[PDB]
Structures are given as structure tokens and as C-alpha cells.
Assembly symmetry: D2
Homo-oligomer: 115 residues x 4
Amino acid sequence: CPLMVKVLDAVRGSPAINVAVHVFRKAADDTWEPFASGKTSESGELHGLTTEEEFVEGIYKVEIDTKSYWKALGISPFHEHAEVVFTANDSGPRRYTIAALLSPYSYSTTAVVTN
Amino acid sequence: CPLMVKVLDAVRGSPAINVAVHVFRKAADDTWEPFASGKTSESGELHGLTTEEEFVEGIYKVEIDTKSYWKALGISPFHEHAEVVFTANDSGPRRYTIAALLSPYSYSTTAVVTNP
Amino acid sequence: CPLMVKVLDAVRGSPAINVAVHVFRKAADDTWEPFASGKTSESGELHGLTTEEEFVEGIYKVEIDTKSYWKALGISPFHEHAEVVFTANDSGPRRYTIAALLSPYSYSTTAVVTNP
Amino acid sequence: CPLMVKVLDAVRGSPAINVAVHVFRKAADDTWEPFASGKTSESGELHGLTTEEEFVEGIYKVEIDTKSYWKALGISPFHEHAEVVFTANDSGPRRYTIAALLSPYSYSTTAVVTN
């Protein structure tokens, strides 16, 4: 599993469950092409997005659908979504976890890149 | 001043100076149209991007060029840029401060929105 | 103004107003001695805590009363308070801004330190 | 395992390994008494701090020794340590993860409290 996403809710102190996540890869015409997507599990994680064979070097974008997540909790959010854009590199460590911590008007995202 | 951007460096504990920032507005046709751009100052702030008149309702995207920033300090960072995407002015004009706090493999962004 | 505190509410996207803040300085004897205190204003800022003269080298602790804050808005938060502990002025006088960004079960704190 | 700590390094994009963590419980004379301590593992985690029997309701403080961690990387830090202070409650969910994300001049901490 080369690319995993983990999302937390800073308001409830809990995983952010059932959050839609869409990943895109930049194509040679500079557009974003759908690459992988899913919904975070009960532990706030999304696994099984891609495989080592398919996850080649390139520029990827991970879009986390935060606004629908907050609307379903009845809390007015600021952002349309949270967006993480990065270059995957074979010289780096082999596994990428994109973590995100969500509040209605604020989020952080951290990449944890390991062996 | 309805839209301002403030950027901090979490490594040095200082403003992030000379950070390029590009703002786009989602078009009628669904594309991102260029809306305004500038660089942060010595205080890590970017003012004067737009006017209440020009800054109408819409979906806006504030792209902060964090990669050039880290690279010019000798660091190879994770993200290409930070992107902040939000609907603005849909309940009337507001003043928006988009803050970002940067580290090489992490950032956070916070909006402070006040009723002018 | 060598020491200032700024507090934001990540839920509402606004300054956190009326947040009580207590500052302590580590004593000669190792205890935390009361150093200064105040409440954030309408802009979520606390100024005038100390003076360059009084603010000497030492280890300081800035305690931000985040629990009273959330509770007065009907939220039962995780933390009793946020505590920020740092050595100050050990390479000469500096100006310190202690920023905090609050959510019910999370906060972050950032120092911006500049050479006056 | 009722209380776990997980620490990440925002500068290197990695778990924060070998970070000392000390936990204290507030005693009836208002002092902090040592309760549990350890060093984060290679995955940035610390487990086995306490047991459900011993972790009773009370006010606890978790001190994460960030300053020594940054000094060992040769990076000048701001804080002496990061401190998380909270009341454990039996009405809450039964497991507490104190997560912390560290930079030299900034840190965040989040409690993820689950079943």
C-alpha cells in the first residue's frame, strides 16, 4: 500500500468517518485525471487506493471533501475541500500517508513518508 | 481590504517573506480564471489583492507557492503549493484573512472572516 | 511590547475573545511564579502584559484558559488549558508573539519571534 | 490500552522517534505526581503507559520532550516541551490517543477519544 489517507475531526476528537476522498494525477496536457477515490472508514482511514505498480512518479492531487463532512454534522464550514498536491518520487521512502486534521474554518495536512 | 493572506514559517518562527500567491475565481464555464496575485512582504502579509467592488460572490482559490519558498532556503519540501478553496461573499460582503503556517512536510491554513 | 498573545477560534473562524491568559516565570527555587495576566480583546489579542525592563531572561509559561472559553459557548472541550513553555531573551531582548488556534479537541500554538 | 501517544515530525515528514514522554497525575495537594513515561518507538508511538485499572478519573498532564528532540537534529527549537493537560472521564469513550505534530517553532496536539 503506497498511498493512504488518514483524516481526524478536531471538533469531536474522533476519526472523520465517511469523508469522500478523490485522487488525481496530472496528465501531460496539464489537466487532472481521476486516479483513485473512496470514503474514509470508521477509523478515518482510506487504504487500497492504488498499487505500487500504478503509483509511478508524477504530480498527484488529493482532494478531501471536507465541506460535505461538516454539512452532515450541521456545522457551517469555510473551505470547499482540502487539497494536497505533491510530486511522488522514487528516490524518497516508499509509502505516503496524507494525514489531515479538520476543523470548520481550519485544517492541517501532513505527509508521513516512510519505508 | 476584503482579502488578505498571511504566511508564517513554523521552522524559523518568523513571517514567510516573499511567498508568491495566486488567486483564481471559478468561472461561469467551470475553469479557474486568474483573479489577482502578489508576494508576501517582510511581515509575511499580502494586502491590496482586490477591492470590495471587484471581489464579488464566487468560489475562489488562493494558491500559495510553498515549494519555491522552501527550496530557496535549501529545503526540498513535500507539497507543490498550498491551495485554499472557498465560497466568498455569498451572504453579503465580508473581510477574509487566509492564514497559512508552513513546515517542510506539513501546513495548516485558517480563515478568519469578519463582517466589515 | 515584547510579549503578546493572539488566539483564534478554528470553529467559527474568528478571534477568540475574552480568553483568560496567565503568564508565569520559573523561579530561582524552581516554582512557577505569577508574572502577568490578562484577557484577549475583540481582536483575540492580549497586549501590555509586560515591559522590556521587566521581561528578563528566564523560562516562561503562557497558560491559555481554553476550557472556560469552550464551555461558555456550550462545548465541553478536551484540554484544561493550552500551556506554552519557552526560554525567553537568552540571546538578548526579543519580541514574542504566542499565537494559539483552538478547536474543542485540538489546538496548535506557534511562536513568532523577532529582533526588535 | 487506555492511553497512547503518537508524535510526528512536520519538518522531515516522519514519525518523531525516541522522543521522551512523561505523564503525571494531579494529586490532592495540587502537585503533579509521576504517573508513566517512555520514549516513542520507530513508528513515533508510545503504548503500554498505563492500564484500565490504574487510569482512573483525574486530571493528567502529558509532557512531550520536544526541545531535546530538535537539539538532536541540530535545529534550534522554541518550546521547552509540549504539554497536554486534560481530565479523564468515564462517561467519555474508553481510549485516549494524544497526537502531536511538531515543528521547531510550532506544534499541534489533538485528542482522539474512541471505543
